[PDB]
RNA sequence: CACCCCCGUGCCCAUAGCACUGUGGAACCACCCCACCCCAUGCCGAACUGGGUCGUGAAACACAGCAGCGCCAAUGAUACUCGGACCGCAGGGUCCCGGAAAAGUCGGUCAGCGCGGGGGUU
RNA sequence: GACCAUGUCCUGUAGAGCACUCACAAGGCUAAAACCUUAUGAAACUCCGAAGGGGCACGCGUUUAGUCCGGGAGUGAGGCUG
């Protein structure tokens, strides 16, 4: 089964560290990748791909990361924890991290 | 009556019965009045005598069973070393716990069967007929 | 036989409603009979000691789901 | 009839068969009974019928005895449970079994054992429930067992037990 | 290659006409073909077992894997952690080829009353196949491979119905 | 929190789960779609994974009905017991006061609260 | 300090139960393990589970002990009852 995600999301015990976590959903390339402060039941920085276009999924993903980096920097955030989903750090998601911390 | 394999030893205590206060299976039955151990052999004598009264019968459930070893110390020995090895098995029998339960035999026949089956026993007992049973 | 082994005086060393210094030991255990909530960290033999000074509080839905937090 | 004894009042040495609650969704009721006069009715009705009670206040209430709590040390009753009857097939009652006549195995064979002296069923009629269940054992051979599946269930009754369960069974001698 | 896909596309309407699905995806398909050698009937040294992996690999254009013995010390020369029989999954082009190797000209046809007598019963996919012997190739020369192990070959297919198993052989080039 | 609905992520932590089942469709999600290469299978693009439309709501998933199952669960009555005070040679047991289960019945439920977004009534 | 009261937390005994382990009672079912109706015991069994009991905090209440530091000791064979 997909015991990848409960495992990786129990390994964010370091939400006790105070950093926010950055969920990603390499599914339909919907890769919405929310930023969450877990303590409240609250999310703070959405970046859904509704009509961003940008072409092939591996590069639209980096576009989603570079746009969300601004979308969260507006509110005043910089500590980061990359709560990957079940997905590997394989590239199409790795571009999201590269472009996200390229412009925190 | 003997238990085919176990762990080796035990202990003891008593308080009133919580398993088998009501009769099933049979027509009539018999119930303890006194807390006690009962040996394998006291059972087997009740079986021998109630099978004497029940020739070609087959209505003899034995809703009790020697679970507990009890181990006397050997001949003449001063204390020191374990509880020797088990000398006989016994069944705890707290009051209100049924022992016996017949069917298929008329009231005075079962009543005599229970007279003899109790007289070999080390306890008071009482015959009961079933009706306040859920 | 006639053998036996030393007592290991294990337990809930600090009961909920007890202020604790940092590094106080609060539960001793063979394993994770307690699973350490926020502020607490669990050692090698799975004793869990508070990190932060404050009150001790028991999160406890039970069945292996009992946790010890500390509130400042 | 019964009187109210809410909470924990003392009982008469006339047993007053106390500790009795009747209940459904609606209301819970008081304990006090009339000792042997209870038993004189209960054996006649014996879970398979209802009878009204009249505490001061409520002049009538039908219940069918759900369960009894007898003493263990002295085979006497103590507490009895009850359930009210909302009518219109709501009743889940344990009918006594009974056996008729000589069986072919009672001719030349041996034992005639009722493996289930009572058995539970729903009753389409609420105020009409069988008081017994006479079973036609005449036609079985030695070593056969009447299963519950062919047990007569008058007037559309359902069977609340396994179709394949044995109820009565002839048994070899010895 | 193209012929196996054509038989797939001819089966799918054949099943929609013998039993209408709302969807072509609802139609039974064939997921994977597995072949399980079991040289625990003839546990050997590395020589013979690697030779059998060699012959399955030559037959397949795949590298067979060794299944390894479970913790189960037993009367029957059983051990702890040792090889006890090859296994080979096939999906994609490597799978259909074998079935087109078997439905058509590459069938050994060494023995055949009809197809193996039906075994899925419940009718969901799993159609197990037994080859009593491998005297069924031009890939071997019998005097050198005088040993003749058998083979198991399980077909896995979707099928929510029992009778639908009939589809996976009748229209799939297999005798029934 | 205008009304629904979808994708996700929390609190909760079987009264939320199972099964039977019906609705769902390019909006969302999902399989199918191809593979020399990113990347990978101790054999297989099944799994990760990279390149996408058709097709299809089949399967999975979401959402409703559902009391066959599980899950919870009184009142009442006991068991037991803190203190008090007793009987039996003994096993053992009783009384006064107060606390008081477990099992079972009665009955309860196929949940309940957030947060961000996506598309709807245009 | 001490008793007593409130609040809180921790416990696996009595009891009670078979849900796992050992045992075990009558049958049905059957290549008998398994399975079902019914029926039971368990120091090394537990789906459960009090009364009590221990730590903390308060004193929302009556009391007078406690703590440490320095001198001197003796005691380290216990007996009964419940
Ligand atoms: Mg004791
Ligand atoms: Mg019982
Ligand atoms: Mg010894
Ligand atoms: Mg009560
Ligand atoms: Mg008191
Ligand atoms: Mg006392
Ligand atoms: Mg009391
Ligand atoms: Mg004080
Ligand atoms: Mg006990
Ligand atoms: Mg103690
Ligand atoms: Mg103060
Ligand atoms: Mg001194
Ligand atoms: Mg001494
Ligand atoms: Mg002493």
Curated annotation (Swiss-Prot), chain B:
InterPro entries: Ribosomal_uL16, Ribosomal_uL16_bact-type, Ribosomal_uL16_CS, Ribosomal_uL16_dom, Ribosomal_uL16_sf. GO terms for biological process: translation. Keywords: Ribonucleoprotein, Ribosomal protein, RNA-binding, rRNA-binding, tRNA-binding. One of its GO terms (molecular function) is rRNA binding. The keyword Ribosomal protein applies. Signal peptide: none annotated. PANTHER family: 50S/60S RIBOSOMAL PROTEIN L16, LARGE RIBOSOMAL SUBUNIT PROTEIN UL16M. Binds the 5S and 23S rRNAs and is also seen to make contacts with the A and P site tRNAs. Interacts with A site tRNA mimics, and is probably one of the key factors, along with a helix of the 23S rRNA, in positioning tRNA stems in the peptidyl-transferase center. Belongs to the universal ribosomal protein uL16 family. This is Large ribosomal subunit protein uL16. It comes from Deinococcus radiodurans (strain ATCC 13939 / DSM 20539 / JCM 16871 / CCUG 27074 / LMG 4051 / NBRC 15346 / NCIMB 9279 / VKM B-1422 / R1). The gene is rplP.
Curated annotation (Swiss-Prot), chain C:
GO terms for cellular component: cytosolic large ribosomal subunit. The chain holds residues 12 to 83 of 91 of the full protein. This is Large ribosomal subunit protein bL27. Keywords: Ribonucleoprotein, Ribosomal protein, RNA-binding, rRNA-binding, tRNA-binding. Belongs to the bacterial ribosomal protein bL27 family. It comes from Deinococcus radiodurans (strain ATCC 13939 / DSM 20539 / JCM 16871 / CCUG 27074 / LMG 4051 / NBRC 15346 / NCIMB 9279 / VKM B-1422 / R1). Part of the 50S ribosomal subunit. Contacts protein L18. One of its GO terms (molecular function) is rRNA binding. Binds the 5S and 23S rRNAs and also the tRNA in the P site. GO terms for biological process: translation.
From Swiss-Prot, chain D:
Residues 1-103 are annotated as: N-terminal domain. Residues 104-174 are annotated as: Middle domain. Keywords: Ribonucleoprotein, Ribosomal protein, RNA-binding, rRNA-binding, tRNA-binding. GO terms for biological process: translation. GO terms for cellular component: cytosolic large ribosomal subunit. The keyword Glycoprotein does not apply. It comes from the Bacteria. The keyword Nucleotide-binding does not apply. Belongs to the bacterial ribosomal protein bL25 family. CTC subfamily. Part of the 50S ribosomal subunit. Contacts proteins L11 and L16, the A site tRNA, and the 5S and 23S rRNAs. This is one of 3 proteins that mediate the attachment of the 5S rRNA onto the large ribosomal subunit. This protein has three domains. The N-terminal one is bound on the solvent face, the middle domain fills the space between the 5S rRNA and the L11 arm contacting the 23S rRNA while the C-terminal domain is on the edge of the intersubunit interface and contacts the A site. The protein conformation changes upon binding of a tRNA mimic to the A site, although the mimic does not interact directly with CTC itself, consistent with CTCs presumed role in moderating A site binding. This is Large ribosomal subunit protein bL25. The gene is rplY.
UniProtKB/Swiss-Prot annotation, chain E:
It holds the Pfam family Ribosomal_L5. Keywords: Ribonucleoprotein, Ribosomal protein, RNA-binding, rRNA-binding, tRNA-binding. GO terms for cellular component: cytosolic large ribosomal subunit. The keyword RNA-binding applies. GO terms for biological process: translation. The keyword Repressor does not apply. It comes from the Bacteria. InterPro entries: Ribosomal_uL5 (IPR002132), Ribosomal_uL5_bac-type (IPR020930), Ribosomal_uL5_C (IPR031309), Ribosomal_uL5_dom_sf (IPR022803), Ribosomal_uL5_N (IPR031310). GO terms for molecular function: RNA binding; rRNA binding; structural constituent of ribosome; tRNA binding. This is one of the proteins that bind and probably mediate the attachment of the 5S RNA into the large ribosomal subunit, where it forms part of the central protuberance. In the 70S ribosome it contacts protein S13 of the 30S subunit (bridge B1b), connecting the 2 subunits; this bridge is implicated in subunit movement. Contacts the P site tRNA; the 5S rRNA and some of its associated proteins might help stabilize positioning of ribosome-bound tRNAs. Forms a bridge to the 30S subunit in the 70S ribosome. Part of the 50S ribosomal subunit; part of the 5S rRNA/L5/L18/L25 (CTC) subcomplex. Is known to contact the 5S rRNA, 23S rRNA and the P site tRNA. Belongs to the universal ribosomal protein uL5 family. This is Large ribosomal subunit protein uL5. The gene is rplE.
């Amino acid at each position: 089964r997909r015991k990848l995600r409960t495992r990786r999301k129990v390994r964010t015990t370091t939400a006790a560290s105070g950093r926010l976590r950055l969920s990603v959903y390499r599914s339909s390339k919907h890769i919405y990748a929310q930023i969450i402060d877990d303590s409240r039941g609250q999310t703070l920085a959405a970046a859904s791909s509704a009509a961003l276009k940008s072409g092939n999924k591996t590069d639209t993903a980096a576009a989603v990361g570079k746009a969300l980096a601004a979308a969260a920097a507006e509110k005043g955030i910089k500590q980061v924890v990359f709560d990957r989903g079940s997905y590997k750090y394989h590239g199409r998601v790795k571009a999201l991290a590269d472009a996200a911390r390229e412009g925190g | 009556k003997r238990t085919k394999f176990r762990k080796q030893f035990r202990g003891r205590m008593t308080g009133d019965a919580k398993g088998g206060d009501y009769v099933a299976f049979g027509d009539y039955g018999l119930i303890a009045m006194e807390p006690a151990w009962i040996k394998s052999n006291q059972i087997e004598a009740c079986r021998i005598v109630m099978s004497r009264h029940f020739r070609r019968g087959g209505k003899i459930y034995i809703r009790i069973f020697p679970d507990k070893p009890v181990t006397k110390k050997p001949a003449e020995t001063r204390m020191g070393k374990g509880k020797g090895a088990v000398e006989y098995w016994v069944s705890v029998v707290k009051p209100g716990r049924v022992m016996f339960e017949v069917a298929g035999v008329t009231e005075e026949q079962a009543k005599e069967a229970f007279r003899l089956a109790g007289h070999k026993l080390p306890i008071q007992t009482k015959m009961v007929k079933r009706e306040v049973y859920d | 036989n006639g053998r036996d082994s030393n007592p290991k005086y294990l337990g809930v060393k600090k009961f909920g409603g007890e202020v604790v210094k940092a590094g106080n030991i609060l539960v001793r255990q063979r394993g994770t009979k307690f699973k350490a909530g926020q502020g607490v960290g669990m050692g090698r033999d799975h004793t869990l000691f508070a990190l932060s000074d404050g009150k001790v509080v028991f999160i406890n839905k039970g069945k292996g789901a009992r946790f010890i937090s500390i509130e400042a | 009839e019964l009187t109210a004894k809410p909470r924990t009042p003392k009982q008469k040495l006339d047993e007053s068969m106390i500790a009795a609650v009747a209940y459904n969704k609606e209301n819970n009721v008081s304990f006090a009974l009339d000792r042997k006069a209870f038993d004189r009715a209960f054996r006649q009705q014996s879970t398979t019928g209802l009878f009204d009670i009249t505490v001061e206040g409520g002049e009538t209430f039908p219940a069918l005895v759900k369960a009894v709590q007898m003493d263990k040390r002295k085979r006497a009753p103590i507490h009895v449970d009850f359930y009210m009857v909302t009518y219109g097939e709501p009743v889940e009652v344990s009918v006594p079994v009974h056996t008729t006549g000589r069986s072919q195995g009672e001719v030349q064979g041996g034992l005639v054992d009722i493996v289930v002296h009572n058995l539970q069923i729903v009753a389409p009629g609420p105020r009409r429930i069988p008081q017994e269940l006479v079973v036609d054992v005449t036609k079985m051979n030695i070593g056969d067992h009447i299963t519950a599946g062919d047990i007569k269930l008058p007037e559309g009754c359902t069977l609340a037990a396994d179709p394949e369960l044995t109820v009565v069974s002839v048994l070899p001698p010895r | 290659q193209q012929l196996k896909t054509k038989y797939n596309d001819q089966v799918r309407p054949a099943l929609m006409q013998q039993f209408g699905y709302s969807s072509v995806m609802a139609v039974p398909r064939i997921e994977k073909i597995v072949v399980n050698e079991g040289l625990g009937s003839s546990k050997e040294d590395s020589k013979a077992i690697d030779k059998a992996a060699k012959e399955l690999a030559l037959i397949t254009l795949q590298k067979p894997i060794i299944t390894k013995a479970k913790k189960s010390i037993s009367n029957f020369k059983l051990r702890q952690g040792m090889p006890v029989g090859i296994k080979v999954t096939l999906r994609g082009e490597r799978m259909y080829v074998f079935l087109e190797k078997l439905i058509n000209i590459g069938l050994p046809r060494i023995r055949d009353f009809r197809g193996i007598n039906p075994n899925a019963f419940d009718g969901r996919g799993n159609y197990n196949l037994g080859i009593k012997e491998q005297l069924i190739f031009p890939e071997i020369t019998y005097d050198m491979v005088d040993k003749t192990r058998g083979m198991d070959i399980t077909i896995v297919t979707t099928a929510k119905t029992d009778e639908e198993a009939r589809a996976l052989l009748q229209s799939m080039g297999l005798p029934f």
